[PDB]
Amino acid sequence: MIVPVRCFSCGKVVGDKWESYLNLLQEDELDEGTALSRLGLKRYCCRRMILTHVDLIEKFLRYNPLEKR
Amino acid sequence: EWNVEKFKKDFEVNISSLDAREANFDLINIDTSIANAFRRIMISEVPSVAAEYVYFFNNTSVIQDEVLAHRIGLVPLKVDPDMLTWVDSNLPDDEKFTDENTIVLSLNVKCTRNPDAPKGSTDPKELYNNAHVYARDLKFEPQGRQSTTFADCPVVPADPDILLAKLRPGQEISLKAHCILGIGGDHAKFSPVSTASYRLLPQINILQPIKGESARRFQKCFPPGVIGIDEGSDEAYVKDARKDTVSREVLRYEEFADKVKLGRVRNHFIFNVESAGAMTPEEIFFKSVRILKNKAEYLKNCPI
Amino acid sequence: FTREQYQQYIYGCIRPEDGHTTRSKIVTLPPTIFKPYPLWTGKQIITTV
Amino acid sequence: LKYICAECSSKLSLSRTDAVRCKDCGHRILLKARTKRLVQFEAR
Amino acid sequence: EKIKLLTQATSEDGTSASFQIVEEDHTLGNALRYVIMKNPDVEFCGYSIPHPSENLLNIRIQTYGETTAVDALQKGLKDLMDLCDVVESKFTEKIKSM
Amino acid sequence: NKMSPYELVQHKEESDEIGGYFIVNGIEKLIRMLIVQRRNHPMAIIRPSFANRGASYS
Amino acid sequence: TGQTPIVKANLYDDYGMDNFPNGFNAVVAVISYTGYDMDDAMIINKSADERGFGYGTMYKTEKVDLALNRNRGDPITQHFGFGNDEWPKEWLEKLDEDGLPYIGTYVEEGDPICAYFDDTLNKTKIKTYHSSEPAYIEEVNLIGDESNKFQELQTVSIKYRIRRTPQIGDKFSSRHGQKGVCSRKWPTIDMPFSETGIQPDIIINPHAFPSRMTIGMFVESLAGKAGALHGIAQDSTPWIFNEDDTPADYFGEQLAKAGYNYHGNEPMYSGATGEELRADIYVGVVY
Amino acid sequence: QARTADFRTLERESRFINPPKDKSAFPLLQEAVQPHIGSFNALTEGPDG
Numbered sequence: 011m012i013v014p015v016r017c018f019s020c021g022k023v024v025g026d027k028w029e030s031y032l033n034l035l036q037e038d039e040l041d042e043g044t045a046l047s048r049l050g051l052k053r054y055c056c057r058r059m060i061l062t063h064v065d066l067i068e069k070f071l072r073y074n075p076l077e078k079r
Numbered sequence: 080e081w082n083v084e085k086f087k088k089d090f091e092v093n094i095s096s097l098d099a100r101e102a103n104f105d106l107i108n109i110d111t112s113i114a115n116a117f118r119r120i121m122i123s124e125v126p127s128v129a130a131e132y133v134y135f136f137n138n139t140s141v142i143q144d145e146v147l148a149h150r151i152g153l154v155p156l157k158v159d160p161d162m163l164t165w166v167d168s169n170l171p172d173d174e175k176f177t178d179e180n181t182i183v184l185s186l187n188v189k190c191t192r193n194p195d196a197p198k199g200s201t202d203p204k205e206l207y208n209n210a211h212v213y214a215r216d217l218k219f220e221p222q223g224r225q226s227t228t229f230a231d232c233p234v235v236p237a238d239p240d241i242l243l244a245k246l247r248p249g250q251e252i253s254l255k256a257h258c259i260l261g262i263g264g265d266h267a268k269f270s271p272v273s274t275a276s277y278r279l280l281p282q283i284n285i286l287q288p289i290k291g292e293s294a295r296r297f298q299k300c301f302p303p304g305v306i307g308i309d310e311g312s313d314e315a316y317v318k319d320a321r322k323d324t325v326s327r328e329v330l331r332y333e334e335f336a337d338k339v340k341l342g343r344v345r346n347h348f349i350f351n352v353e354s355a356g357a358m359t360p361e362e363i364f365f366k367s368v369r370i371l372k373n374k375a376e377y378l379k380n381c382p383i
Numbered sequence: 384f385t386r387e388q389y390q391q392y393i394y395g396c397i398r399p400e401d402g403h404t405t406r407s408k409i410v411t412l413p414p415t416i417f418k419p420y421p422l423w424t425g426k427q428i429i430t431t432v
Numbered sequence: 433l434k435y436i437c438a439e440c441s442s443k444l445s446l447s448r449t450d451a452v453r454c455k456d457c458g459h460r461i462l463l464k465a466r467t468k469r470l471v472q473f474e475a476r
Numbered sequence: 477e478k479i480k481l482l483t484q485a486t487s488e489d490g491t492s493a494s495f496q497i498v499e500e501d502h503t504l505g506n507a508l509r510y511v512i513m514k515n516p517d518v519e520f521c522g523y524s525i526p527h528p529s530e531n532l533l534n535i536r537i538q539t540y541g542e543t544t545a546v547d548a549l550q551k552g553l554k555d556l557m558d559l560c561d562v563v564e565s566k567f568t569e570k571i572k573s574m
Numbered sequence: 575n576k577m578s579p580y581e582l583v584q585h586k587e588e589s590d591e592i593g594g595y596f597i598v599n600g601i602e603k604l605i606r607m608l609i610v611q612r613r614n615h616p617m618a619i620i621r622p623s624f625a626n627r628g629a630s631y632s
Numbered sequence: 633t634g635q636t637p638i639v640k641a642n643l644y645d646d647y648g649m650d651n652f653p654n655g656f657n658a659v660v661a662v663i664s665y666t667g668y669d670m671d672d673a674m675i676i677n678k679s680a681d682e683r684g685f686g687y688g689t690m691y692k693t694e695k696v697d698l699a700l701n702r703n704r705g706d707p708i709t710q711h712f713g714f715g716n717d718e719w720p721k722e723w724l725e726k727l728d729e730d731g732l733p734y735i736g737t738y739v740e741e742g743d744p745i746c747a748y749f750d751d752t753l754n755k756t757k758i759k760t761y762h763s764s765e766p767a768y769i770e771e772v773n774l775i776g777d778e779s780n781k782f783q784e785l786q787t788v789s790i791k792y793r794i795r796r797t798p799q800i801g802d803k804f805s806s807r808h809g810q811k812g813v814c815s816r817k818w819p820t821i822d823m824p825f826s827e828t829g830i831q832p833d834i835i836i837n838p839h840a841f842p843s844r845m846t847i848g849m850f851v852e853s854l855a856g857k858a859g860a861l862h863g864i865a866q867d868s869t870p871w872i873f874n875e876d877d878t879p880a881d882y883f884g885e886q887l888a889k890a891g892y893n894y895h896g897n898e899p900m901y902s903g904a905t906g907e908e909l910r911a912d913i914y915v916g917v918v919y
Numbered sequence: 920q921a922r923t924a925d926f927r928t929l930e931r932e933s934r935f936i937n938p939p940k941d942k943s944a945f946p947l948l949q950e951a952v953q954p955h956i957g958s959f960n961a962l963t964e965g966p967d968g
């Protein structure tokens with residue numbers, strides 16, 4: 011749903027690298043392999059977290075019962 | 080014959096690099112039994128401080144309560160575990176959390192709609208106020224006498240841009256978090272280490288001379304800083320047997336079924352300790368030889 | 384198997400205090416090879432098991 | 433103000449023996465809002 | 477109650493004895509077993525966890541005589557203490573070189 | 575019916591919400607598809623149960 | 633937290649199944665190491681689901697209704713809230729002044745779900761939570777009746793959330809038919825570890841493969857791992873490979889360009905003894 | 920590399936923020952229920968009322 015803090019297989023902090031990843035794919039036109047290497051994600055357990063995150067919380071947050079629509 | 084001076088004559092350490100987060104060093108002529116015991120304390124038994132009890136007051140955001148509490152458990156806190164002591168489980172909840180064994184964090188964030196947003200925008204940081212809750216929004220609240228000993232260094236998360244939660248206007252999060260000590264064998268959040276593991280030194284045993292244009296392809300079957308060619312005579316030799324992962328790429332070729340075999344140096348270790356932020360990996364390894372020393376020192380004093 | 388390996392696999396399976404042995408002391412065999420260094424065999428694991 | 437309308441999201445209060453509906457629009461479903469209270473979790 | 481000599485497996489001579497340590501694992505059990513197998517008087521030794529879900533660690537010591545198994549365990553705990561002291565000094569000898 | 579996936583989120587439903595089903599007493603029921611004989615085609619059929627219409631039935 | 637797979641068909645992104653993630657990528661080592669996963673079972677890294685690996689909840693909703701025992705315009709004998717009698721003040725912790733429970737509170741078996749005053753008995757009865765498994769209260773709906781006569785509420789819908797942390801005995805599965813319950817949450821210091829520093833978060837037995845003949849899970853291990861190194865998704869819609877170009881030739885050369893081997897094996901150590909294992913261990917990220 | 924799909928990030932992520940104000944993405948998912956939608960529509964509109 012939202013980006014996993016502290017990836018599952020080793021324990022490297024990963025949750026602070028989602029918004030830096032979308033920055034390094036949109037403004038700086040990098041492919042997904044260079045951007046995971048610039049963020050310091052070397053081990054392929056750490057790479058498949060930011061690479062394969064869906065960020066589904068942005069679809070949940072459009073149903074706000076605490077605001078007029 | 081074995082002796083602690085015979086082991087002192089043979090053991091040495093060759094450190095490759097230091098950093099604020101990642102060390103890389105060597106253990107020479109030590110057993111796999113002992114080098115695992117150092118490897119298993121740095122992950123499971125060296126203490127660290129992490130949020131264990133989270134006291135919610137209001138949470139109207141979309142991410143629910145135990146998931147957002149589990150994420151506050153997983154954020155590393157840049158705080159020295161030597162500054163505060165352990166809790167006692169037999170004490171009740173009124174006297175268990177003192178200012179010598181508990182650091183208090185707070186997260187009071189409210190979201191509202193930004194009227195200064197540009198028309199036809201998509202960016203929620205322009206479009207909303209306090210829409211993204213990060214790890215640096217966890218505020219340290221010194222209680223009692225710890226407003227003097229932590230005034231030199233306030234408790235801040237070691238990775239402040241951890242995206243804890245996301246909000247929309249109307250929604251709010253208000254909590255208090257008590258972060259205490261613990262070892263990595265209880266929960267994974269108390270491990271101060273990204274990964275701490277070894278690999279033994281690869282031994283590339285060239286058996287026959289690899290002169291000619293076979294050395295231009297024997298070099299290609301390794302990472303580039305491992306096999307070099309001599310400038311005097313064309314002959315493959317090992318430059319650096321540390322730079323290779325053990326791929327066995329030469330074992331896919333019938334040309335090199337006899338000219339090389341890939342052994343492994345028996346007692347040469349390469350530790351690569353990556354810290355999570357609170358302690359330096361110089362100190363995490365130093366605390367791991369002290370836990371194993373005090374573990375044998377504890378049984379030496381207990382009555383049998 | 385060397386001497387530390389050979390005796391590790393026996394106490395990992397026998398464990399006399401739970402009552403699997405019948406001698407109150409774990410007996411072993413002489414090794415298969417005596418020189419240069421003593422080695423046992425996996426035949427000789429299950430022999431003393 | 434303890435309840436929220438499901439349609440127009442107006443924070444309303446509902447007295448005793450009162451018509452269970454919102455006042456800004458006639459919607460018959462009300463959401464009980466979350467009031468500030470201590471809830472305890474172990475972060476595991 | 478940390479260390480406990482299992483009296484249903486010890487010997488009258490004191491040469492064979494089974495111990496049992498609470499809340500330990502392969503970290504201490506494999507490390508201590510290597511050190512006591514360097515003692516040239518120990519005949520048999522090994523460690524064994526009964527069940528992994530229960531934090532229990534048995535350690536067997538059998539010897540050739542002239543030393544009890546308790547006196548062997550105190551030597552192996554002393555030398556595993558000393559082995560951790562010479563790897564701590566030499567790490568400090570090289571961390572100050574840089 | 576003709577709502578955009580924007581307007582299906584503003585009406586609480588889901589963005590790419592496919593329909594197809596009936597809401598009956600809060601439960602999402604739907605009537606299954608059944609595979610059955612083709613319309614308007616006389617097909618020659620041999621069945622042993624056609625003999626049990628009486629005597630002299632083939 | 634669901635994930636999109638490294639290894640997916642091209643029809644996956646065409647029906648929009650990224651909108652509905654039904655699983656997660658897991659470092660799966662095909663290894664007989666543990667002893668606890670032999671016949672059909674499996675294990676998880678213990679520190680994997682201390683970090684949220686495979687965590688899910690369960691949302692249960694029941695409707696408490698106070699007007700299914702009457703008819704035709706009688707006075708409503710049952711009202712939400714508290715009366716003026718001597719009712720015990722124990723359950724102010726769960727319930728609000730409306731006789732309705734607070735949002736977010738923790739409810740085990742025997743706690744009250746709602747309080748209502750009864751007129752034919754002059755007593756505040758409470759209904760209670762008839763479930764042996766604890767839950768948290770997420771939302772409380774006030775279902776109001778539609779009539780010309782405006783009516784006090786008789787119908788309340790309450791939704792529970794139940795923390796389903798993955799215990800042992802829970803069934804996981806691959807995308808190939810390889811199901812199996814969890815045997816033990818095996819701790820990280822007792823698991824095998826590679827030379828790259830990682831540890832698998834799933835161990836599966838190699839004896840589940842020969843009788844089942846699922847080589848799509850073997851080649852997902854090469855395809856999943858070689859896509860995790862390069863940051864690419866390889867498609868896996870069927871019959872994109874011939875007998876000439878085997879995918880084990882295709883995904884092997886992708887692993888060989890990264891430094892790993894052509895066969896998808898890694899040199900792993902033990903967690904208990906710490907020794908170098910005999911053969912290199914077949915690992916990879918499958919979904 | 921011929922047999923590679925793509926992680927459609929910045930398209931998946933952009934579509935999550937704002938849903939399309941024109942017709943829906945993934946029209947092949949809408950065709951999977953057209954024998955249900957188009958069968959209820961036939962009994963109210965079409966030829967002969």
Ligand SMILES: [Zn+2]
Pocket residue numbers: 017018019020021022053055056057
């Ligand atoms: Zn990782």
Ligand SMILES: [Zn+2]
Pocket residue numbers: 437438439440441442454455456457458459
């Ligand atoms: Zn309304």
